[PDB]
Design an enzyme around this catalytic site. Structure first.
Site, mmCIF file in Angstrom:
data_model
loop_
_atom_site.group_PDB
_atom_site.id
_atom_site.type_symbol
_atom_site.label_atom_id
_atom_site.label_comp_id
_atom_site.label_asym_id
_atom_site.label_seq_id
_atom_site.Cartn_x
_atom_site.Cartn_y
_atom_site.Cartn_z
ATOM 1 N N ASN A 94 20.469 -1.671 -20.152
ATOM 2 C CA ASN A 94 20.372 -3.127 -20.098
ATOM 3 C C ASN A 94 19.344 -3.718 -19.100
ATOM 4 O O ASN A 94 18.835 -4.823 -19.324
ATOM 5 C CB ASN A 94 21.780 -3.638 -19.789
ATOM 6 C CG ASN A 94 21.881 -5.097 -19.442
ATOM 7 O OD1 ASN A 94 21.859 -5.955 -20.323
ATOM 8 N ND2 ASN A 94 21.975 -5.397 -18.136
ATOM 9 N N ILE A 96 16.049 -4.701 -16.840
ATOM 10 C CA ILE A 96 14.650 -5.057 -17.107
ATOM 11 C C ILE A 96 14.006 -5.366 -15.766
ATOM 12 O O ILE A 96 14.705 -5.746 -14.816
ATOM 13 C CB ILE A 96 14.437 -6.249 -18.077
ATOM 14 C CG1 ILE A 96 15.178 -7.536 -17.604
ATOM 15 C CG2 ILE A 96 14.800 -5.869 -19.560
ATOM 16 C CD1 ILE A 96 14.797 -8.852 -18.352
ATOM 17 N N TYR A 158 6.780 -8.210 -21.820
ATOM 18 C CA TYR A 158 8.199 -8.070 -22.106
ATOM 19 C C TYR A 158 8.390 -7.728 -23.600
ATOM 20 O O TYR A 158 9.091 -6.771 -23.923
ATOM 21 C CB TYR A 158 8.883 -9.405 -21.741
ATOM 22 C CG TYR A 158 10.343 -9.523 -22.121
ATOM 23 C CD1 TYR A 158 11.338 -9.016 -21.293
ATOM 24 C CD2 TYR A 158 10.730 -10.180 -23.288
ATOM 25 C CE1 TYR A 158 12.689 -9.173 -21.608
ATOM 26 C CE2 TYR A 158 12.076 -10.359 -23.607
ATOM 27 C CZ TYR A 158 13.054 -9.872 -22.749
ATOM 28 O OH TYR A 158 14.386 -10.040 -23.050
ATOM 29 N N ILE A 193 20.212 -16.321 -23.852
ATOM 30 C CA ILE A 193 21.541 -16.218 -23.213
ATOM 31 C C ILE A 193 21.503 -16.961 -21.895
ATOM 32 O O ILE A 193 20.522 -16.850 -21.142
ATOM 33 C CB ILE A 193 21.953 -14.729 -22.997
ATOM 34 C CG1 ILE A 193 21.715 -13.844 -24.276
ATOM 35 C CG2 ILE A 193 23.397 -14.622 -22.488
ATOM 36 C CD1 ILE A 193 22.463 -14.330 -25.600
ATOM 37 N N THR A 195 22.104 -16.722 -18.822
ATOM 38 C CA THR A 195 22.134 -16.060 -17.512
ATOM 39 C C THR A 195 21.351 -16.907 -16.536
ATOM 40 O O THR A 195 20.426 -17.606 -16.961
ATOM 41 C CB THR A 195 21.561 -14.618 -17.582
ATOM 42 O OG1 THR A 195 20.170 -14.678 -17.917
ATOM 43 C CG2 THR A 195 22.306 -13.741 -18.585
ATOM 44 N N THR A 197 19.101 -16.065 -14.333
ATOM 45 C CA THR A 197 17.692 -15.675 -14.366
ATOM 46 C C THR A 197 16.954 -16.340 -15.523
ATOM 47 O O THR A 197 15.880 -16.914 -15.297
ATOM 48 C CB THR A 197 17.550 -14.145 -14.440
ATOM 49 O OG1 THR A 197 18.212 -13.552 -13.327
ATOM 50 C CG2 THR A 197 16.085 -13.691 -14.461
HETATM 51 N N1 LIG Z 1 19.075 -13.748 -20.667
HETATM 52 C C1 LIG Z 1 18.493 -13.826 -21.917
HETATM 53 O O1 LIG Z 1 18.216 -14.922 -22.495
HETATM 54 C C2 LIG Z 1 18.239 -12.552 -22.732
HETATM 55 C C3 LIG Z 1 17.785 -12.692 -24.050
HETATM 56 C C4 LIG Z 1 17.532 -11.562 -24.843
HETATM 57 C C5 LIG Z 1 17.750 -10.308 -24.287
HETATM 58 N N2 LIG Z 1 18.196 -10.179 -23.011
HETATM 59 C C6 LIG Z 1 18.334 -8.812 -22.474
HETATM 60 O O2 LIG Z 1 19.540 -8.711 -21.736
HETATM 61 C C7 LIG Z 1 19.284 -7.786 -20.640
HETATM 62 C C8 LIG Z 1 19.835 -8.474 -19.360
HETATM 63 O O3 LIG Z 1 19.113 -9.707 -19.200
HETATM 64 P P1 LIG Z 1 19.795 -10.715 -18.095
HETATM 65 O O4 LIG Z 1 19.341 -12.098 -18.519
HETATM 66 O O5 LIG Z 1 21.241 -10.438 -17.851
HETATM 67 O O6 LIG Z 1 18.945 -10.332 -16.824
HETATM 68 P P2 LIG Z 1 19.295 -10.514 -15.262
HETATM 69 O O7 LIG Z 1 20.492 -11.401 -15.128
HETATM 70 O O8 LIG Z 1 18.049 -10.894 -14.530
HETATM 71 O O9 LIG Z 1 19.745 -9.050 -14.737
HETATM 72 C C9 LIG Z 1 18.763 -7.993 -14.639
HETATM 73 C C10 LIG Z 1 19.498 -6.781 -14.124
HETATM 74 O O10 LIG Z 1 18.536 -5.689 -14.035
HETATM 75 C C11 LIG Z 1 18.433 -5.219 -12.657
HETATM 76 N N3 LIG Z 1 17.065 -4.770 -12.362
HETATM 77 C C12 LIG Z 1 15.839 -5.535 -12.173
HETATM 78 N N4 LIG Z 1 14.822 -4.740 -11.771
HETATM 79 C C13 LIG Z 1 15.382 -3.466 -11.719
HETATM 80 C C14 LIG Z 1 14.900 -2.193 -11.385
HETATM 81 N N5 LIG Z 1 13.628 -1.962 -10.941
HETATM 82 N N6 LIG Z 1 15.714 -1.120 -11.383
HETATM 83 C C15 LIG Z 1 17.034 -1.221 -11.783
HETATM 84 N N7 LIG Z 1 17.583 -2.392 -12.118
HETATM 85 C C16 LIG Z 1 16.751 -3.479 -12.088
HETATM 86 C C17 LIG Z 1 18.881 -6.448 -11.782
HETATM 87 O O11 LIG Z 1 19.411 -6.095 -10.510
HETATM 88 P P3 LIG Z 1 18.635 -5.779 -9.179
HETATM 89 O O12 LIG Z 1 17.615 -6.867 -8.979
HETATM 90 O O13 LIG Z 1 19.744 -5.677 -8.171
HETATM 91 O O14 LIG Z 1 17.995 -4.436 -9.419
HETATM 92 C C18 LIG Z 1 19.969 -7.074 -12.689
HETATM 93 O O15 LIG Z 1 21.171 -6.354 -12.534
HETATM 94 C C19 LIG Z 1 17.807 -7.399 -20.600
HETATM 95 O O16 LIG Z 1 17.639 -6.167 -21.349
HETATM 96 C C20 LIG Z 1 17.212 -8.504 -21.461
HETATM 97 O O17 LIG Z 1 15.981 -8.171 -22.059
HETATM 98 C C21 LIG Z 1 18.459 -11.272 -22.193
HETATM 99 N N1 LIG Z 2 11.453 -14.621 -17.555
HETATM 100 C C1 LIG Z 2 12.427 -14.109 -17.905
HETATM 101 C C2 LIG Z 2 13.624 -13.466 -18.399
HETATM 102 N N2 LIG Z 2 14.732 -13.417 -17.636
HETATM 103 C C3 LIG Z 2 15.872 -12.855 -18.066
HETATM 104 C C4 LIG Z 2 15.934 -12.278 -19.352
HETATM 105 C C5 LIG Z 2 14.768 -12.240 -20.153
HETATM 106 C C6 LIG Z 2 13.601 -12.884 -19.685
HETATM 107 C C7 LIG Z 2 12.304 -12.883 -20.474
HETATM 108 S S1 LIG Z 2 12.033 -14.527 -21.221
HETATM 109 C C8 LIG Z 2 12.780 -14.493 -22.803
HETATM 110 N N3 LIG Z 2 13.461 -13.395 -23.124
HETATM 111 C C9 LIG Z 2 14.033 -13.252 -24.322
HETATM 112 O O1 LIG Z 2 14.700 -12.087 -24.540
HETATM 113 C C10 LIG Z 2 14.010 -14.296 -25.265
HETATM 114 C C11 LIG Z 2 14.688 -14.154 -26.536
HETATM 115 N N4 LIG Z 2 15.278 -14.035 -27.524
HETATM 116 C C12 LIG Z 2 13.314 -15.475 -24.937
HETATM 117 C C13 LIG Z 2 12.669 -15.562 -23.688
HETATM 118 C C14 LIG Z 2 11.922 -16.829 -23.299
HETATM 119 O O2 LIG Z 2 11.509 -17.595 -24.440
HETATM 120 C C15 LIG Z 2 12.639 -17.909 -25.251
HETATM 121 C C16 LIG Z 2 13.196 -16.632 -25.908
#
Ligand SMILES: NC(=O)c1ccc[n+]([C@@H]2O[C@H](COP(=O)([O-])OP(=O)(O)OC[C@H]3O[C@@H](n4cnc5c(N)ncnc54)[C@H](OP(=O)(O)O)[C@@H]3O)[C@@H](O)[C@H]2O)c1
Ligand SMILES: N#Cc1ncccc1CSc1nc(O)c(C#N)c2c1COCC2
Ligand SMILES: NC(=O)c1ccc[n+]([C@@H]2O[C@H](COP(=O)([O-])OP(=O)(O)OC[C@H]3O[C@@H](n4cnc5c(N)ncnc54)[C@H](OP(=O)(O)O)[C@@H]3O)[C@@H](O)[C@H]2O)c1
Ligand SMILES: N#Cc1ncccc1CSc1nc(O)c(C#N)c2c1COCC2
Lengths: 262, 281
Positions: A94, A96, A158, A193, A195, A197
């Site tokens: 999970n 990134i 990304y 989502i 989150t 971040t």
């Molecule tokens: N939020 C969205 O809208 C969204 C949309 C589509 C997909 N996703 C996917 O969901 C996943 C989680 O996203 P999120 O929004 O929950 O992100 P997030 O809240 O920023 O969490 C990122 C996690 O990864 C860890 N991380 C960052 N750099 C790292 C490194 N060098 N080594 C190990 N761990 C590291 C962070 O902790 P530390 O900084 O403590 O290492 C944190 O636990 C990602 O795969 C993302 O692509 C998210």
């Molecule tokens: N910057 C940043 C960041 N922080 C946390 C998680 C992912 C990211 C990367 S931005 C990002 N990531 C995605 O996965 C989607 C989708 N679907 C979208 C964006 C931003 O544009 C809308 C859709």
């Protein structure tokens, strides 16, 4: 049909679990009575997640802090997590690297770091986990994005890393099928989502409706437990209507007739 | 006579009907051009009267390609030998190629690292090298070329594969690198549209081609009909010249019927209105 008892006593790794979706997955797994090993760089935040997992009802909970930029840490982490739990049933990939919305100009360093953390470390973790997952007929869960299936501006590095996960993991899924490796691979295609971040990063730029992190985290776990090839989770019904690619599945089946993998 | 001549080849119907005169006097880089499809592209470009700069690691083989390009009618032909594993070489190569031609109209990114068909087990070194050579070097080359391509309203041509659009066993590292090219280049295409960067990006989705390397690699493992390398190379050039977003080329009429993904195009158009990029423009 998913039932929470499917995770009871299961040995699960969750990466990127100090915050956002990863932390929510650790909490769901704890409530379901799974054994969990969580990782991220923030030792102090991981300590709090583990304490909370134990309160929620985890069979056991441990953290191992480190950076997934370090491929030796990734390999050693899986061996230690497996030793703590006495095996492994599910590997949830999970994490990134930190990113932001920006036009691409010349930041090759960010492109390479995104490929190393978001993609290559997932491969290293899979190689390290496979012997244990083969023993348990386990599961690999790969967290991806709509930006890993269609193109989006401002997230080039990304998006390249998420597309790479599809190519790599979908190829090995076909290999495991013919080689009788009973390890499922679930690719999770998530939309925006809520989150902290993501919400901070998109503020004033992207106006899409964000889906709740708690429900998102549960849908990922369900997909893995049910051994589904792909999970699609987004706020929009039009996204859910258009995201699937049935023509890709048909082509792969048509090309399946052309192999001698003996 | 050249100083007393002017005009444009790209008039009515030029976005749909190719003419070899569209490459006449165009300044083109072809990577991975010592053999296979890249060599065939250099030969087609030479016949069209383009200025060419070819690259690969083999100094001796590139020497021979350059000599044949000149025989075929290239306006000029040069080579620069080096490895795309070296990001400094990739960056410096574009500057030197541009200096030799006095600019750049088309950047054809075609090279790949040597690979073979094998089940994936633990060769992480091959996965990383495939990502560095097949993907990261393409980004480095693009960054180095962009100022010249912006000046000429030029084109980037990215050679990919059906294994860069659908999954295939035995090519996991290769497939990951080709999928990465789609995500990266398709994202920057959208950024160039909003930033008014008049540089086209053509992603070429090729099926099995009868190159010596591929034919040897698939022998006894993959039983598919291979398409001819000469026609393949021309279809890549045509797509780049017509500024097409994607080129599809395969032996099977069924592949060409099913490979397009209209749902992806619809979704991207629906999400195109989901942002406010005013702080970037
Ligand atoms: N939020 C969205 O809208 C969204 C949309 C589509 C997909 N996703 C996917 O969901 C996943 C989680 O996203 P999120 O929004 O929950 O992100 P997030 O809240 O920023 O969490 C990122 C996690 O990864 C860890 N991380 C960052 N750099 C790292 C490194 N060098 N080594 C190990 N761990 C590291 C962070 O902790 P530390 O900084 O403590 O290492 C944190 O636990 C990602 O795969 C993302 O692509 C998210
Ligand atoms: N910057 C940043 C960041 N922080 C946390 C998680 C992912 C990211 C990367 S931005 C990002 N990531 C995605 O996965 C989607 C989708 N679907 C979208 C964006 C931003 O544009 C809308 C859709
Ligand atoms: N043939 C097929 O069936 C097929 C199918 C789909 C897509 N494609 C795509 O078509 C393109 C060409 O494939 P091909 O079959 O024509 O390949 P090929 O005949 O094997 O040619 C590979 C070229 O890349 C160069 N190269 C290899 N390693 C390099 C390195 N480290 N640095 C710089 N140059 C390097 C090679 O020369 P040196 O060894 O002298 O450096 C040679 O010029 C690739 O993008 C491939 O993915 C091919
Ligand atoms: N090994 C090797 C090698 N040599 C030259 C070019 C590409 C390669 C990489 S194998 C490869 N490359 C592709 O692009 C496709 C497609 N479509 C396919 C294969 C092999 O399986 C059939 C489909």
């Amino acid at each position: 049909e998913f039932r929470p008892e499917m995770l009871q006593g299961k040995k699960v790794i969750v990466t990127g679990a100090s915050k956002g979706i990863g932390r929510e997955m650790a909490y769901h797994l704890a409530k379901m009575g799974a054994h969990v090993v969580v990782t991220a760089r923030s030792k102090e935040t991981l300590q709090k997640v583990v304490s909370h997992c134990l309160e929620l009802g985890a069979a056991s909970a441990h953290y191992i802090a480190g950076t997934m930029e370090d491929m030796t840490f990734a390999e050693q982490f899986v061996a230690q997590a497996g030793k703590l739990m006495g095996g492994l049933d599910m590997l949830i990939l999970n994490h990134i690297t930190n990113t932001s919305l920006n036009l691409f100009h010349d930041d090759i360093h960010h492109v390479r770091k995104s490929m190393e953390v978001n993609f290559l470390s997932y491969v290293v973790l899979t190689v390290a986990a496979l012997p244990m997952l083969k023993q348990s007929n386990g599961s690999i869960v790969v967290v991806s994005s709509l930006a890993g299936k269609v193109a989006y501006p401002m997230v080039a590095a990304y998006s390249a890393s998420k597309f790479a996960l599809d190519g790599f993991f979908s190829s090995i899924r076909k290999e495991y099928s013919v080689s009788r490796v009973n390890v499922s691979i679930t690719l999770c295609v998530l939309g925006l989502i809520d989150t902290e971040t993501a919400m901070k990063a998109v503020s004033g730029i992207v106006h899409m409706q964000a889906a709740p992190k708690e429900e998102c985290a549960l849908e990922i776990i369900k997909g893995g437990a049910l051994r589904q090839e792909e999970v699609y989770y987004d706020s929009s019904r039009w996204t859910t209507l258009l995201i699937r690619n049935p023509c890709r599945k048909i082509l792969e089946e048509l090309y399946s007739t052309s192999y001698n993998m003996d």
